[PDB]
Amino acid sequence: ELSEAERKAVQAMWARLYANSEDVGVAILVRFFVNFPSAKQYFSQFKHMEDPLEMERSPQLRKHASRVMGALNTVVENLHDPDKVSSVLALVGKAHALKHKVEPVYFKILSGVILEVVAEEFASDFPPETQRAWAKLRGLIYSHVTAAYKEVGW
Amino acid sequence: ELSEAERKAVQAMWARLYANSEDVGVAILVRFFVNFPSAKQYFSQFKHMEDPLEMERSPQLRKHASRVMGALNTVVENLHDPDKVSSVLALVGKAHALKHKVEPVYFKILSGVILEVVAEEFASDFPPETQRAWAKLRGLIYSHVTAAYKEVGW
Ligand code: HEM
Ligand code: HEM
């Protein structure tokens, strides 16, 4: 559903984020886990953290961030190829249904946190056209992930 | 569930906020709706809106900001009366379940947007102990509303 311009606009914003990838990744997760403590129950090495400075150093915190960014990157780079995005987003879907038993609405919650951070850090580089492209990428991530949860039971 | 020092902390911050409750309520609802566009399905008058500048002028949006600020202001003033806070929250949660047919997860979500925005208002002065007084208030709101939804068969 993404146009060529919307594609290019996502890839171009993404390149700015991922220039400072782990810094952005951990800002995203720290805002996520602070504002939604319930999401942090799934992570056995920091279910018990409350102080954001401590989250901004927790081993298994910056692991999830680095490999989360890494898998999202794999999506953005391959937006020219819808077969490739489908395949990736199902692996992420299935893994989270099966391996970590995460309620699928948390994807929706985390995407809203991703959006707010991108809006803060790159307000000036975020015109209506990009806001649209980002929104469509978000719905796509959520749809494919949601389907990979149905395909497996849930 | 909430300590006396903690109630005074929440009442101090809230009072400073209520002096400008019009813009604070709208700031919160607009962030809510931009960051979680699916929460707009329930409001037929904005909903077709994407621009935050447009959203802050929508009367359905801004009526609902006052409703939200008003209910939350009578939870905060009555934190000495745990039976009063509890009754007000049951009512909001019973009403939104039955009349407004709103999925209870959006209360999780909006609570986190409220927290995000309090945290940005008092960024200069927001030490760990005020943080968690707000987080305790937050969870109190959420579980009381959730308990009402359970009470009516949802
Ligand atoms: C854009 C959406 C997401 C992406 C791309 C993503 C990516 C990943 C990846 C690549 C891994 C490592 C491989 C694996 O364990 O399967 C992982 C681990 C994990 N994720 Fe996600 N994730 C996302 C959303 C979420 C959400 C919303 C939660 C709920 C809190 C969550 C909870 C977890 C947990 C508990 C682990 C295990 C960490 C560990 O075992 O050390 N994920 N994630
Ligand atoms: C602390 C959280 C909330 C409070 C205190 C609150 C309070 C209120 C109040 C007082 C009203 C006026 C009607 C009535 O008395 O029930 C109202 C209307 C309404 N609310 Fe909420 N609300 C909250 C959260 C939400 C959320 C998260 C949603 C959507 C996801 C929502 C959806 C609606 C809708 C659809 C209406 C009526 C729409 C209209 O005809 O204007 N509310 N709310």
Side-chain angles (χ1 to χ4, degrees):
Chain A
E1 50 183 16
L2 275 105
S3 75
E4 217 66 27
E6 282 163 352
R7 246 114 109 155
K8 275 170 151 145
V10 157
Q11 290 177 337
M13 176 108 298
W14 188 256
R16 308 181 145 104
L17 298 205
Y18 197 85
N20 294 277
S21 175
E22 281 142 46
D23 280 330
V24 170
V26 313
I28 287 152
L29 300 197
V30 169
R31 202 144 277 228
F32 175 53
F33 293 134
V34 173
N35 295 335
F36 301 95
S38 59
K40 108 196 138 189
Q41 100 204 36
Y42 297 112
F43 301 77
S44 76
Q45 271 322 271
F46 57 88
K47 50 195 181 221
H48 32 80
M49 270 166 236
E50 334 176 345
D51 184 358
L53 294 195
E54 220 43 270
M55 290 170 199
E56 194 216 308
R57 336 260 259 168
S58 160
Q60 229 102 81
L61 193 316
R62 317 222 335 167
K63 179 209 233 150
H64 183 235
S66 163
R67 196 117 129 265
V68 169
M69 293 284 104
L72 280 181
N73 185 49
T74 293
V75 180
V76 160
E77 285 186 334
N78 289 108
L79 284 179
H80 185 280
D81 195 346
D83 284 341
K84 192 91 195 84
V85 312
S86 248
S87 104
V88 172
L89 286 174
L91 240 31
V92 175
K94 269 133 99 207
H96 285 91
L98 290 188
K99 200 184 240 196
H100 349 319
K101 302 170 284 213
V102 180
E103 299 268 282
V105 286
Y106 287 106
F107 284 81
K108 184 133 109 66
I109 289 170
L110 188 60
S111 285
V113 169
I114 292 172
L115 172 64
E116 189 32 56
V117 172
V118 171
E120 275 166 11
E121 287 297 318
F122 304 85
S124 307
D125 313 57
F126 209 43
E129 182 218 58
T130 306
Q131 284 180 212
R132 239 208 346 285
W134 207 274
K136 314 223 307 216
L137 180 74
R138 174 195 182 154
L140 179 134
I141 289 179
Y142 193 53
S143 201
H144 281 239
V145 162
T146 241
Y149 267 73
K150 292 267 160 85
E151 186 181 313
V152 182
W154 213 269
Chain B
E1 234 270 9
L2 216 151
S3 91
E4 190 64 53
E6 277 170 326
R7 327 221 267 215
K8 296 196 182 174
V10 164
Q11 289 181 341
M13 303 328 126
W14 183 257
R16 210 118 216 173
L17 220 70
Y18 202 65
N20 311 311
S21 64
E22 311 74 32
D23 331 314
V24 160
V26 169
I28 297 157
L29 242 40
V30 164
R31 177 90 94 241
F32 182 45
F33 286 122
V34 164
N35 287 347
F36 299 96
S38 81
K40 304 190 297 209
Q41 63 202 113
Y42 305 117
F43 299 84
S44 72
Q45 304 287 109
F46 54 101
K47 172 171 79 66
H48 61 100
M49 270 161 230
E50 334 250 59
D51 203 323
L53 291 201
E54 226 59 62
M55 277 176 203
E56 50 195 284
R57 292 280 94 167
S58 156
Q60 228 217 314
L61 180 140
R62 112 190 323 263
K63 174 170 146 236
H64 181 231
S66 280
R67 266 78 240 279
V68 179
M69 290 310 267
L72 263 11
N73 172 91
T74 106
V75 176
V76 168
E77 286 174 350
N78 291 126
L79 286 170
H80 75 129
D81 183 2
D83 325 276
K84 175 56 150 151
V85 291
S86 142
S87 99
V88 168
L89 290 163
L91 249 303
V92 165
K94 202 149 141 199
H96 286 70
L98 302 164
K99 276 83 203 112
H100 305 135
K101 242 216 193 64
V102 176
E103 259 183 26
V105 78
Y106 288 102
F107 278 87
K108 184 180 262 182
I109 300 179
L110 175 69
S111 287
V113 179
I114 293 162
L115 198 116
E116 201 172 41
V117 181
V118 153
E120 294 177 13
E121 292 289 17
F122 311 111
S124 278
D125 189 275
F126 215 58
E129 223 56 28
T130 315
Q131 254 152 279
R132 77 182 243 116
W134 272 99
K136 228 142 149 287
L137 171 60
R138 181 265 182 88
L140 185 45
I141 290 160
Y142 183 59
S143 38
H144 265 5
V145 170
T146 253
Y149 272 83
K150 218 66 199 243
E151 241 199 323
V152 308
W154 198 316

Short mmCIF file of all heavy atoms in Angstrom, two decimals, chain A residues 32 39 42-43 60 63-64 67-68 71-72 92 95-96 99-100 102 106-107 110, ligand 1:
data_model
loop_
_atom_site.label_atom_id
_atom_site.label_comp_id
_atom_site.label_asym_id
_atom_site.label_seq_id
_atom_site.Cartn_x
_atom_site.Cartn_y
_atom_site.Cartn_z
N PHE A 32 8.87 3.38 26.41
CA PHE A 32 7.87 2.33 26.29
C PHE A 32 7.63 1.67 27.64
O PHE A 32 6.52 1.66 28.12
CB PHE A 32 8.34 1.32 25.26
CG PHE A 32 7.47 0.12 25.12
CD1 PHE A 32 6.12 0.26 24.89
CD2 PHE A 32 8.02 -1.15 25.18
CE1 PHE A 32 5.32 -0.85 24.73
CE2 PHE A 32 7.21 -2.25 25.04
CZ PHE A 32 5.86 -2.09 24.80
N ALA A 39 4.40 -3.91 29.93
CA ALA A 39 5.11 -4.51 28.80
C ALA A 39 6.42 -5.15 29.24
O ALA A 39 6.96 -6.05 28.58
CB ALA A 39 5.39 -3.48 27.77
N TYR A 42 7.27 -9.25 30.33
CA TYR A 42 7.75 -10.29 29.43
C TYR A 42 9.28 -10.48 29.46
O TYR A 42 9.77 -11.45 28.93
CB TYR A 42 7.28 -9.99 27.98
CG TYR A 42 5.78 -10.01 27.78
CD1 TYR A 42 5.08 -8.85 27.50
CD2 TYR A 42 5.06 -11.19 27.91
CE1 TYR A 42 3.69 -8.85 27.33
CE2 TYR A 42 3.69 -11.22 27.75
CZ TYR A 42 3.00 -10.05 27.45
OH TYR A 42 1.63 -10.08 27.31
N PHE A 43 10.03 -9.55 30.05
CA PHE A 43 11.49 -9.58 30.00
C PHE A 43 12.01 -9.93 31.35
O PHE A 43 11.97 -9.10 32.26
CB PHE A 43 12.05 -8.23 29.59
CG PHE A 43 11.57 -7.79 28.28
CD1 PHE A 43 10.29 -7.27 28.15
CD2 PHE A 43 12.36 -7.93 27.15
CE1 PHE A 43 9.82 -6.90 26.93
CE2 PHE A 43 11.88 -7.53 25.91
CZ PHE A 43 10.62 -7.02 25.81
N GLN A 60 19.85 -6.71 29.12
CA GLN A 60 18.80 -7.25 28.24
C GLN A 60 17.81 -6.19 27.75
O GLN A 60 16.90 -6.49 26.99
CB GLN A 60 18.05 -8.42 28.92
CG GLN A 60 17.93 -9.66 28.02
CD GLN A 60 18.92 -10.75 28.38
OE1 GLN A 60 18.69 -11.52 29.32
NE2 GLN A 60 20.02 -10.83 27.64
N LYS A 63 19.72 -5.02 24.45
CA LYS A 63 19.75 -6.16 23.53
C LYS A 63 18.49 -6.13 22.69
O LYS A 63 18.54 -6.15 21.45
CB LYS A 63 19.80 -7.48 24.32
CG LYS A 63 19.80 -8.76 23.47
CD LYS A 63 19.16 -9.94 24.21
CE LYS A 63 20.04 -11.19 24.26
NZ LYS A 63 19.80 -12.00 25.48
N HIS A 64 17.36 -6.08 23.37
CA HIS A 64 16.09 -6.00 22.68
C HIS A 64 16.06 -4.77 21.74
O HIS A 64 15.52 -4.83 20.63
CB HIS A 64 14.95 -5.96 23.71
CG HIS A 64 13.59 -5.93 23.11
ND1 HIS A 64 12.66 -4.95 23.40
CD2 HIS A 64 13.00 -6.75 22.20
CE1 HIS A 64 11.56 -5.17 22.71
NE2 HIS A 64 11.74 -6.26 21.98
N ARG A 67 18.44 -5.37 18.53
CA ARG A 67 17.92 -6.36 17.59
C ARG A 67 16.51 -6.01 17.13
O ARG A 67 16.06 -6.52 16.12
CB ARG A 67 17.98 -7.78 18.19
CG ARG A 67 17.82 -8.90 17.16
CD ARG A 67 19.01 -9.83 17.00
NE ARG A 67 18.58 -11.22 17.11
CZ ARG A 67 18.61 -11.95 18.23
NH1 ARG A 67 19.06 -11.45 19.38
NH2 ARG A 67 18.19 -13.21 18.20
N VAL A 68 15.83 -5.13 17.86
CA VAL A 68 14.53 -4.62 17.41
C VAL A 68 14.76 -3.69 16.22
O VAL A 68 14.12 -3.81 15.18
CB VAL A 68 13.77 -3.87 18.54
CG1 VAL A 68 12.56 -3.10 17.99
CG2 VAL A 68 13.33 -4.83 19.62
N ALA A 71 15.82 -5.62 13.10
CA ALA A 71 14.74 -6.26 12.35
C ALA A 71 13.83 -5.27 11.63
O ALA A 71 13.22 -5.61 10.63
CB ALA A 71 13.93 -7.09 13.26
N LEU A 72 13.71 -4.06 12.18
CA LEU A 72 12.91 -3.01 11.59
C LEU A 72 13.63 -2.49 10.36
O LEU A 72 13.02 -2.31 9.33
CB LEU A 72 12.69 -1.87 12.58
CG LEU A 72 11.60 -2.07 13.63
CD1 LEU A 72 11.50 -0.83 14.52
CD2 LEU A 72 10.27 -2.39 12.96
N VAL A 92 8.77 -12.37 12.94
CA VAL A 92 8.65 -11.59 14.16
C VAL A 92 7.30 -11.89 14.84
O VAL A 92 7.26 -12.03 16.05
CB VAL A 92 8.83 -10.09 13.91
CG1 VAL A 92 8.58 -9.31 15.20
CG2 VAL A 92 10.24 -9.81 13.40
N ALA A 95 7.45 -15.71 16.33
CA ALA A 95 8.40 -15.70 17.45
C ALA A 95 7.78 -15.09 18.72
O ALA A 95 8.02 -15.54 19.83
CB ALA A 95 9.68 -14.96 17.08
N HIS A 96 6.97 -14.06 18.56
CA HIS A 96 6.42 -13.35 19.69
C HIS A 96 5.15 -14.02 20.21
O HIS A 96 4.85 -13.95 21.39
CB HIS A 96 6.21 -11.88 19.32
CG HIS A 96 7.48 -11.08 19.27
ND1 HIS A 96 8.23 -10.93 18.12
CD2 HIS A 96 8.14 -10.40 20.23
CE1 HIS A 96 9.28 -10.18 18.38
NE2 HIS A 96 9.26 -9.85 19.66
N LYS A 99 7.42 -18.02 21.26
CA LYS A 99 8.63 -17.97 22.07
C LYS A 99 8.46 -17.04 23.29
O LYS A 99 8.86 -17.40 24.42
CB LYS A 99 9.83 -17.54 21.16
CG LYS A 99 11.24 -17.85 21.66
CD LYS A 99 12.34 -17.28 20.71
CE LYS A 99 13.25 -18.35 20.12
NZ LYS A 99 14.53 -17.87 19.52
N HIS A 100 7.88 -15.85 23.12
CA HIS A 100 7.76 -14.94 24.27
C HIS A 100 6.30 -14.69 24.73
O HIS A 100 6.10 -14.02 25.73
CB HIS A 100 8.54 -13.61 24.10
CG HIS A 100 9.48 -13.56 22.93
ND1 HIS A 100 10.29 -14.61 22.56
CD2 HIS A 100 9.78 -12.55 22.08
CE1 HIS A 100 11.01 -14.27 21.51
NE2 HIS A 100 10.72 -13.02 21.20
N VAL A 102 3.71 -12.90 23.87
CA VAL A 102 3.31 -11.50 24.01
C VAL A 102 1.93 -11.25 23.39
O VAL A 102 1.65 -11.68 22.29
CB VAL A 102 4.33 -10.57 23.32
CG1 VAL A 102 3.92 -9.11 23.45
CG2 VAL A 102 5.74 -10.82 23.86
N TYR A 106 0.38 -5.06 22.35
CA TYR A 106 1.63 -4.39 22.67
C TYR A 106 2.43 -3.90 21.43
O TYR A 106 3.18 -2.93 21.51
CB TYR A 106 2.47 -5.30 23.54
CG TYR A 106 1.93 -5.37 24.92
CD1 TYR A 106 1.26 -6.49 25.37
CD2 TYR A 106 2.07 -4.30 25.78
CE1 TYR A 106 0.76 -6.55 26.65
CE2 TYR A 106 1.59 -4.36 27.07
CZ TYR A 106 0.94 -5.48 27.49
OH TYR A 106 0.46 -5.51 28.77
N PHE A 107 2.30 -4.58 20.31
CA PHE A 107 2.86 -4.06 19.08
C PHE A 107 2.26 -2.68 18.75
O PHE A 107 2.99 -1.76 18.35
CB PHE A 107 2.62 -5.05 17.94
CG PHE A 107 3.53 -6.22 18.00
CD1 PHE A 107 3.25 -7.29 18.84
CD2 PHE A 107 4.70 -6.24 17.28
CE1 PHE A 107 4.11 -8.35 18.95
CE2 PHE A 107 5.55 -7.32 17.38
CZ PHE A 107 5.24 -8.38 18.23
N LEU A 110 3.68 -0.11 21.30
CA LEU A 110 5.08 0.22 20.98
C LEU A 110 5.22 1.08 19.72
O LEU A 110 6.12 1.91 19.66
CB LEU A 110 5.95 -1.05 20.82
CG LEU A 110 7.47 -0.85 20.65
CD1 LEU A 110 8.19 -0.13 21.82
CD2 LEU A 110 8.08 -2.20 20.48
C1 HEM C 1 8.36 -3.75 15.98
C2 HEM C 1 7.99 -4.73 16.83
C3 HEM C 1 9.02 -5.70 17.46
C4 HEM C 1 10.16 -6.16 16.92
C5 HEM C 1 10.75 -5.90 15.52
C6 HEM C 1 10.79 -7.03 17.87
C7 HEM C 1 11.96 -7.70 17.68
C8 HEM C 1 12.53 -8.62 18.52
C9 HEM C 1 13.63 -9.48 18.19
C10 HEM C 1 14.35 -9.49 16.82
C11 HEM C 1 13.89 -10.25 19.26
C12 HEM C 1 15.02 -11.32 19.34
C13 HEM C 1 14.63 -12.60 18.59
C14 HEM C 1 13.47 -13.24 19.30
O1 HEM C 1 13.57 -13.37 20.53
O2 HEM C 1 12.45 -13.62 18.66
C15 HEM C 1 12.96 -9.88 20.31
C16 HEM C 1 12.87 -10.38 21.59
C17 HEM C 1 11.87 -10.15 22.53
N1 HEM C 1 10.76 -9.32 22.38
FE1 HEM C 1 10.42 -8.21 20.59
N2 HEM C 1 10.01 -7.06 18.99
C18 HEM C 1 8.91 -6.25 18.80
C19 HEM C 1 7.89 -6.01 19.72
C20 HEM C 1 7.80 -6.52 21.00
C21 HEM C 1 6.79 -6.21 22.01
C22 HEM C 1 5.62 -5.22 21.84
C23 HEM C 1 7.05 -6.91 23.11
C24 HEM C 1 6.23 -6.90 24.42
C25 HEM C 1 6.73 -6.34 25.51
C26 HEM C 1 8.21 -7.72 22.84
C27 HEM C 1 8.79 -8.61 23.72
C28 HEM C 1 9.95 -9.33 23.52
C29 HEM C 1 10.52 -10.24 24.48
C30 HEM C 1 10.01 -10.59 25.88
C31 HEM C 1 11.79 -10.76 23.85
C32 HEM C 1 12.73 -11.76 24.52
C33 HEM C 1 13.99 -11.02 24.98
C34 HEM C 1 14.99 -12.02 25.47
O3 HEM C 1 14.61 -13.22 25.52
O4 HEM C 1 16.15 -11.66 25.82
N3 HEM C 1 8.62 -7.45 21.55
N4 HEM C 1 12.17 -8.88 19.81
#
